[PDB]
């Protein structure tokens, strides 16, 4: 039982650790996916900007 | 014959040229001070742990 409840105690906090793991990469994988959608934004925005530019050139 | 036309033909571009003038001097006087910021993302990807404060 010792051996259970110690083998889950580290099982479960290498799962807290895995789960925050998941979380905070998680939290980037969405933190990233902003910045990715804020600059693939600005990106767009500088290609219809830049279209715009172009077509007033 | 023609010192009056060559005259106000002179002055005319002279007025517009001296604007011109007036504003681009100082705006290439602040032309490197036009600058922005960066807007730099943590996104906490740094972290190997739990904070210690007591929202999480």
Known sequence: ?57 | MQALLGARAKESLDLRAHLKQVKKEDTEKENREVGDWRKNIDALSGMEGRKKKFES
């Open chain 1, 1 to 57: 039982l010792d051996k259970y409840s110690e083998a889950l105690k580290d099982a479960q906090e290498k799962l807290e650790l895995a789960e925050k793991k998941a979380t905070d990469a998680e939290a980037d994988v969405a933190s990233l996916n902003r910045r990715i959608q804020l600059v693939e934004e600005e990106l767009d925005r500088a290609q219809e900007r830049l279209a715009t530019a172009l077509q007033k050139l």
